[PDB]
Design a protein around this motif. Structure first.
Motif, PDB file in Angstrom:
ATOM      1  N   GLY A 150      13.922   2.948  -0.692  1.00  0.00           N
ATOM      2  CA  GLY A 150      14.475   3.265   0.698  1.00  0.00           C
ATOM      3  C   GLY A 150      13.668   3.382   1.821  1.00  0.00           C
ATOM      4  N   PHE A 151      12.420   3.387   1.675  1.00  0.00           N
ATOM      5  CA  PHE A 151      11.369   3.568   2.760  1.00  0.00           C
ATOM      6  C   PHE A 151      10.787   2.287   2.812  1.00  0.00           C
ATOM      7  CE2 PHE A 151      11.929   7.983   3.190  1.00  0.00           C
ATOM      8  CZ  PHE A 151      12.697   8.527   1.944  1.00  0.00           C
ATOM      9  N   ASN A 152      11.020   1.258   2.463  1.00  0.00           N
ATOM     10  CA  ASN A 152      10.807  -0.007   2.908  1.00  0.00           C
ATOM     11  C   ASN A 152      11.864  -0.894   3.239  1.00  0.00           C
ATOM     12  OD1 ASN A 152       7.925  -1.623   2.368  1.00  0.00           O
ATOM     13  ND2 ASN A 152       9.350  -3.361   1.895  1.00  0.00           N
TER      14      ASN A 152
ATOM     15  N   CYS B  22       0.882  -1.099   0.081  1.00  0.00           N
ATOM     16  CA  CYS B  22      -0.073  -0.020   0.028  1.00  0.00           C
ATOM     17  C   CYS B  22       0.989   1.300   0.230  1.00  0.00           C
ATOM     18  CB  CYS B  22      -1.114  -0.024   1.083  1.00  0.00           C
ATOM     19  SG  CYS B  22      -1.833   1.220   1.707  1.00  0.00           S
ATOM     20  N   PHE B  23       1.964   1.222   0.804  1.00  0.00           N
ATOM     21  CA  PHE B  23       2.977   2.218   0.632  1.00  0.00           C
ATOM     22  C   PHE B  23       4.308   1.978  -0.248  1.00  0.00           C
ATOM     23  CE2 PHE B  23       0.693   2.201   4.704  1.00  0.00           C
ATOM     24  CZ  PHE B  23      -0.196   3.405   4.498  1.00  0.00           C
ATOM     25  N   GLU B  24       4.253   1.211  -1.370  1.00  0.00           N
ATOM     26  CA  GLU B  24       5.445   0.566  -1.849  1.00  0.00           C
ATOM     27  C   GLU B  24       6.112   1.892  -2.718  1.00  0.00           C
ATOM     28  OE1 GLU B  24       6.302  -3.620  -3.548  1.00  0.00           O
ATOM     29  OE2 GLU B  24       4.565  -2.584  -4.350  1.00  0.00           O
ATOM     30  N   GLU B  25       5.352   2.766  -3.230  1.00  0.00           N
ATOM     31  CA  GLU B  25       6.048   4.056  -3.979  1.00  0.00           C
ATOM     32  C   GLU B  25       5.706   5.132  -3.265  1.00  0.00           C
ATOM     33  OE1 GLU B  25       5.299   3.874  -8.155  1.00  0.00           O
ATOM     34  OE2 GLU B  25       4.173   2.066  -7.999  1.00  0.00           O
ATOM     35  N   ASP B  26       5.701   5.155  -1.932  1.00  0.00           N
ATOM     36  CA  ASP B  26       5.464   6.309  -1.013  1.00  0.00           C
ATOM     37  C   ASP B  26       6.439   6.536  -0.205  1.00  0.00           C
ATOM     38  OD1 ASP B  26       4.287   8.247   0.188  1.00  0.00           O
ATOM     39  OD2 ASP B  26       2.323   7.132   0.746  1.00  0.00           O
ATOM     40  N   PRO B  27       7.326   7.600  -0.042  1.00  0.00           N
ATOM     41  CA  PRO B  27       8.404   7.940   0.732  1.00  0.00           C
ATOM     42  C   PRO B  27       7.960   8.693   2.055  1.00  0.00           C
ATOM     43  CG  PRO B  27       8.328   9.528  -0.981  1.00  0.00           C
ATOM     44  CD  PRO B  27       7.195   8.434  -1.380  1.00  0.00           C
ATOM     45  N   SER B  28       6.592   8.803   2.238  1.00  0.00           N
ATOM     46  CA  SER B  28       6.065   9.554   3.491  1.00  0.00           C
ATOM     47  C   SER B  28       5.771   8.414   4.374  1.00  0.00           C
ATOM     48  CB  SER B  28       4.662  10.344   3.273  1.00  0.00           C
ATOM     49  OG  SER B  28       3.696   9.550   2.411  1.00  0.00           O
ATOM     50  N   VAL B  29       5.770   7.280   4.178  1.00  0.00           N
ATOM     51  CA  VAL B  29       5.500   6.273   5.232  1.00  0.00           C
ATOM     52  C   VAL B  29       6.529   5.170   5.270  1.00  0.00           C
ATOM     53  CG1 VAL B  29       3.815   4.090   5.886  1.00  0.00           C
ATOM     54  CG2 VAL B  29       2.941   6.563   5.019  1.00  0.00           C
ATOM     55  N   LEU B  30       7.286   5.125   6.080  1.00  0.00           N
ATOM     56  CA  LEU B  30       8.499   4.327   6.323  1.00  0.00           C
ATOM     57  C   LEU B  30       8.091   3.034   6.971  1.00  0.00           C
ATOM     58  CD1 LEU B  30      12.027   5.281   7.716  1.00  0.00           C
ATOM     59  CD2 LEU B  30      11.198   3.023   6.927  1.00  0.00           C
TER      60      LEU B  30
HETATM   61  K   LIG Z   1       7.027   2.805   2.032  1.00  0.00           K
END
Ligand SMILES: [K+]
Ligand SMILES: NCCCNCCCCCS
Ligand SMILES: [K+]
Ligand SMILES: [Zn+2]
Length: 616
Positions: A223-225, A184-192
């Protein structure tokens, strides 16, 4: 500032269960929820927490992370008989549906958003939601692994939309991989998203290649997963703390999250039939405590798995204990992580190094006592007593004539040190304290020598200043951590760090990378903090993270009265929330100095290891 801890729970979420034979879902039972609450009730912990009521999640909130077609399909399960519910659950992997599960799913989701609102509105410092069903496995358009809707995904998206948050940290310490949260947050740098999980080279459920350390997120999510796969069972406390000190905490303090959410599954604890790990429940009191200096303490813990009833309740209580600020239990028997854990840790740091440069390597009910100077009067919180018996006075005179030409106020400095230590170790009335001192050489000596006879089997000494101190670190009952400026190292029982804008980010890399792993292995009975009179933007984080050692019994000696320094150390000692930070990456000369010290100490202090050992 906020105060208290919310406990969101409701007996209604225990009124659904598996209705047919299925060895995959038999372990997920309503009694997981009732056992956890009664365990909190027995220990008097539920009674100390603000009980926020449970609400339902509106469909506009559910659609934040799920498709209309999947919601419409789940919305129809309450009307199905058991035969129709068997067919609907076969469409998904390792999940069962009940007439009441759509109802409880909206309650588990609503309970998380309730917890998010409570924490973000400053109505509580932190909180935990005891909910059912779990969430972290469910995906945009499928149920999976006992999960219907992704409760923790809702929390982060909800807090993004309704509070304009830009940096959220999700820590998933369940033993299974939260693939729904990753997707759900794969391409999302706001949710580590951080997740450790039983992997066993993909042979353990859900058997996903993307559960491996290789998946670091796509696009700008890169970098955020952070996946940390356990490839062997039987992981111990040292493995868990190593994974924190050398993977999660360095990344977390650099991310500087504005809100921390926890997928708290306790199937990662000893006795659990599904995880087969060997971490004791006390480890979760430290896992919680190490994350509280993040986001000014704003932490929402959400329940996931944990399927051994006779052991689930113990880990829940340890988490809530730390949420309420109670002293953390001493962890004994810590050492290096096992080789497989060192393998995964070494691998995940390498893949992530291109995004977090600190991972690069070179090629091969009174809680606090304040004793300010005489005449000084400050405004202290409700749990600080602001400070001398004749039994103590005869002792200061006894030590006077034997060890110290001492004609002085200073004799009151040592008289307080003796009685604050008496109240910390013996009486168990006070937990920690801080004393402003005149002369160091005599105050350090009496504090340390009187502590060893309290008795204190081992004393950790953290000293921020230059020059030598009257401390003999040969017996091994004393470890010295000195942060100075001039290059000073010899035996393997001292840790000297001779450090610009640089420093605050270097001190943090050293605190989580070197100071905390040694201190945790050392297992002190008392921490002794000293600061020379001669710029501690980090001292609040230092005094807070170090309280995990020695059941929180720390005594700080500050040479020279500094109004705002003493105000900060007391605030962290008493348990208040800690302000975050930005900073500039540490200088190459400091990263070199830091690992040149890991090389020198990791043979004796194996918890410093973050690579597999070089076998001769
Ligand atoms: K993420
Ligand atoms: N023996 C059945 C294994 C099915 N795995 C379900 C995942 C449970 C994790 C909930 S956090
Ligand atoms: K996990
Ligand atoms: Zn699990």
């Amino acid at each position: 500032a906020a105060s208290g801890s919310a406990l969101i729970f409701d007996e209604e979420m225990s009124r659904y269960k598996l209705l047919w034979t299925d060895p995959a879902c038999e372990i997920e039972v309503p009694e997981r929820l009732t056992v956890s609450y009664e365990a909190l009730r027995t220990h008097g912990l539920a009674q100390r927490c603000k009980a926020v009521p449970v609400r339902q999640a509106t469909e506009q909130e559910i659609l934040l992370a799920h498709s209309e077609e999947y919601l419409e399909a789940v919305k129809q399960t309450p009307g199905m008989n058991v035969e129709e519910l068997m067919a609907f659950s076969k469409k998904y992997n390792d999940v069962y549906f009940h007439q009441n599960i759509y109802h409880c799913a909206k309650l588990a989701a609503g309970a998380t958003l309730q917890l998010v609102d409570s924490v973000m509105k400053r109505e509580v410092r932190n909180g935990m939601a005891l909910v059912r069903p779990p969430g972290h496995h469910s995906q945009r358009s499928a149920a999976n692994g006992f999960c219907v809707f992704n409760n923790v995904a809702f929390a982060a998206l909800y807090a993004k939309k309704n509070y304009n948050l830009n940096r959220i940290l999700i820590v998933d310490w369940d033993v299974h991989h939260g693939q729904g949260i990753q997707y759900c947050f794969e391409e999302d740098p706001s949710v580590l998203y951080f997740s450790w999980h039983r992997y066993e080279h993909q042979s353990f459920w859900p058997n996903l290649p993307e559960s491996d350390y290789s998946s670091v997120g796509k696009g700008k999510g890169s970098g955020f997963n952070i996946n940390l796969p356990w490839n062997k069972v039987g992981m111990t406390n040292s493995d868990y703390l190593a994974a924190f000190f050398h993977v999660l905490l360095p990344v977390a303090y650099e991310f500087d999250p504005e809100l921390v959410i926890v997928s708290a599954g306790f199937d990662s604890a000893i006795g659990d039939p599904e995880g087969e790990m060997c971490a004791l429940p006390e480890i979760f009191a430290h896992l919680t405590h190490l994350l509280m200096p993040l986001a000014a303490g704003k932490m929402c813990v959400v329940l996931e798995g944990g399927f051994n009833l006779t052991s689930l309740g113990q880990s829940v209580c340890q988490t809530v204990h730390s949420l309420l600020g109670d002293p953390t239990p001493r962890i004994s028997g810590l050492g290096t992580a096992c080789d497989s854990a060192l393998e995964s840790i070494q691998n995940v740091r390498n893949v992530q190094s291109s995004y977090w440069s600190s991972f690069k390597h070179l090629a091969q009910s009174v809680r606090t006592v304040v004793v300010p100077p005489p005449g000084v009067e400050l405004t202290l919180p409700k749990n600080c007593q602001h400070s001398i018996s004749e039994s103590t006075a005869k002792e200061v005179q006894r030590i006077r004539d034997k060890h110290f030409d001492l004609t002085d106020n200073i004799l009151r400095s040592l008289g307080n040190i003796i009685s604050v230590l008496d109240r910390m170790m013996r009486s168990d009335e006070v937990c920690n304290g801080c004393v402003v001192v005149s002369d160091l050489s005599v105050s350090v000596q009496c504090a340390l020598q009187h502590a060893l006879t309290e008795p204190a089997e081992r004393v950790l000494v953290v000293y921020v200043g230059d020059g030598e101190l009257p401390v003999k670190t040969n017996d091994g009952k004393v470890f010295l951590v000195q942060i100075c400026t001039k290059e000073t190292d010899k035996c393997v029982n001292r840790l000297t760090l001779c450090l610009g804008e640089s420093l605050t980010a270097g001190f943090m890399q050293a605190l989580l990378g070197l100071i905390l792993p040694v201190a945790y292995e050392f297992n002190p009975a008392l921490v002794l903090g000293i600061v020379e009179e001669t710029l501690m933007r980090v001292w609040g984080h230092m005094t807070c993270l170090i309280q995990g050692l020695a059941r929180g019994r720390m005594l700080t000696l500050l040479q020279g009265y500094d109004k705002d320094l003493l105000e900060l150390t007391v605030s962290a000692l008493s348990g208040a929330s800690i302000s975050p930070l930005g900073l500039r990456a540490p200088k190459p000369e400091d990263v070199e100095m830091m690992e040149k010290q890991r090389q020198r100490l990791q043979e004796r202090w194996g918890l410093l290891r973050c690579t597999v050992s070089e076998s001769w």
